[PDB]
Amino acid sequence: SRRRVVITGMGMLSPLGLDVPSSWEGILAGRSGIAPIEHMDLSAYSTRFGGSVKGFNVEEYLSAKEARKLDLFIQYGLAASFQAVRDSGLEVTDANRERIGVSMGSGIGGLTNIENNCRSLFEQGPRRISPFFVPGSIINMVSGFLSIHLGLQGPNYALTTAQTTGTHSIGMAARNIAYGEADVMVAGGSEMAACGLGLGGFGAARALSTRNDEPTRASRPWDRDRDGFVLSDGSGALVLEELEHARARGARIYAELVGFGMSGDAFHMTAPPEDGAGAARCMKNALRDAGLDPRQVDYINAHGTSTPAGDIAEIAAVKSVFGEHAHALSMSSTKSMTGHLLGAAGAVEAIFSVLALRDQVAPPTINLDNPDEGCDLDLVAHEAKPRKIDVALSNSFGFGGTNGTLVFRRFA
Amino acid sequence: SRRRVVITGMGMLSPLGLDVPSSWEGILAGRSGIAPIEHMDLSAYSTRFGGSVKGFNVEEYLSAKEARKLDLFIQYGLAASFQAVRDSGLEVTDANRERIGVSMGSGIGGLTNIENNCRSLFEQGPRRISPFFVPGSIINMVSGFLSIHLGLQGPNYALTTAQTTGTHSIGMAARNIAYGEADVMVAGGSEMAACGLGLGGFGAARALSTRNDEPTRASRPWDRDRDGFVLSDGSGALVLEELEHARARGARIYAELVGFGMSGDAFHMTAPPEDGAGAARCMKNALRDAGLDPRQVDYINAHGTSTPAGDIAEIAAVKSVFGEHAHALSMSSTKSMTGHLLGAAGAVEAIFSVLALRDQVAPPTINLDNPDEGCDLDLVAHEAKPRKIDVALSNSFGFGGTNGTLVFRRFA
């Protein structure tokens, strides 16, 4: 048998705000965090908008000297991790520090730092590359820096599974606790790829909305006028905790993490299969992991990226998995508001799924003005929907055909 | 309930050879694969040598059309994966494809692709960025492309934990099989960071040997004249397999993977503590995991990077863990010959550890002419030592104080 895993702490930077309760207020009001990107010449670029983190103050977390050494994606990781640990009330001691680990990941990592260090390498040669370039940019330094600052000696690692990183990080953090390798983990992801290489990289693949005239309307999952996803920045982080350990110290428990699914499409590098067979296997694996029958699911936080092929495959997968229950469950895409935080997408959407359990409300899919062929499920168009939710799914489907599903259940 | 995990396949690219056997003959013969780098102009760099993969033909594995769009780390990752799966004699069917996953990792990833597309972006503009830039560069696409080529629909992910990547990838892939998430995993890592950003970034942090005039003598772990690590490129992949699944198909079994440890130093972003405290925690967890008396350990394949601080911390860690038995076991650094393949160090060194069990031989530490203060263990200076090896242990340490230990033993 296996230990049960609860959420005792949550932390976040999104395009909707600098913490969870502000972000969530935005989610439930159907606000967009999408706007033209500032302080950057995007003239030669086909996309000029995204979800930026607005008014982030890194000195709330770090000295100016330590923040200077660290990619924006690491600063966002640390902010969310610190918020989450503080949200948990957890106290690290000599007695427990070896039982507390970190799995914070990122899809794309330190592009902003790689751009600046390239600028210097090409203009001036290697001798202007920063000393802190490697340790200030590599993806495992959110885990590394947080572990050093808080004295965490538990499992210390980072995942990079593109747009599935946050979901994988949280699920495999939960595995560490359930099989007794740790009692507490800080898990999620962070991303800042609304930079030249991010917008250029994804623009070159024509993966991005080019709807520059109405940036708030660009992200329209399942709408017949969608034209690709919206690149967004930020971080999610949860404190996962073994249930007995949480009860003993009198922790506030948001929800129980009951199920983790993984699967590979083994199909295509960027495109899912049309029937979502991989997402369907993953969701089944997640429900079996939880010992739940598909009928018990009430809410799904879709991947719902606003790509033609991606949005339709998720409908196919849900119909397949859930048969005569696929219309009963509510399924929204909060990317309609936040855009796609890539590796951080799963972290922030896990939090939104937890808070849909707390508040008994399905968040909206905004911009779903004209559902496409076959998109006839309860996609919670335009407006939040209060309803009964005992069990919430959060899905993530990534490049390389890598899939992740988390199942959260109400704790009482 | 926890299942046993054996090695049925291995595959490799190293500075010593284009596969495992040719690599291994180099290891046993004490050959260096370190040489001035020929593939670029490094006259403006303080380090102008490393461990290149020599004569690599990607068209032994992939069509030119696919290879062109993939970073060398990914080509190297697939070449090792393909070798390993072929060497396992495993056949992939509808019966088993859902039970076969992949976790191939990288510390630094697609830095050549990211540098070249950065060059394109600043000299020309976003219109010259390759459409294949993201899928052909991000770290999780070794696992992705492998899954697409072989039809592996099991758990699909990648770790990025710097110089620990390969050990963590292998260990967590065994935890997948152990806990029943998969029956087979292809796990390891790949690296190709020998570009301007790679040599420059590590050069700017003053971490690299500058012994440009004698590159074969540069990597000298525990020698008093060591002056930094040597940067090397390549790939290690292993087929991990549940024991009864291996027995059921008459798999040839190289050895059993009995033990995995992780720990955080929670000390420093780049420097190990002088006492080897987090390395000691990590080996103690690994040994307890394997249910072993620490006197059972015959051979340690050390991290052994040829840094002043890293090398001595290891002696301390080993002495602290093994007490007087620290004088009986043999410890060596194959990095004396391969140099440091970073996130792939853990993968090729796991294979070296398994081959040390099969051929009953401790590979040498070359260039160990004058061992440093405290470095008084059997470090297998100069020449391979034939000796009894039932239990072999492979250590890795990384930036962010992230530690990994694997324990292998002979299987009969």
Ligand SMILES: CCC(=O)Nc1nc(C)cs1
């Ligand atoms: C190491 C992180 C990484 O691969 N990031 C990438 N971003 C792009 C846009 C391509 S590869």
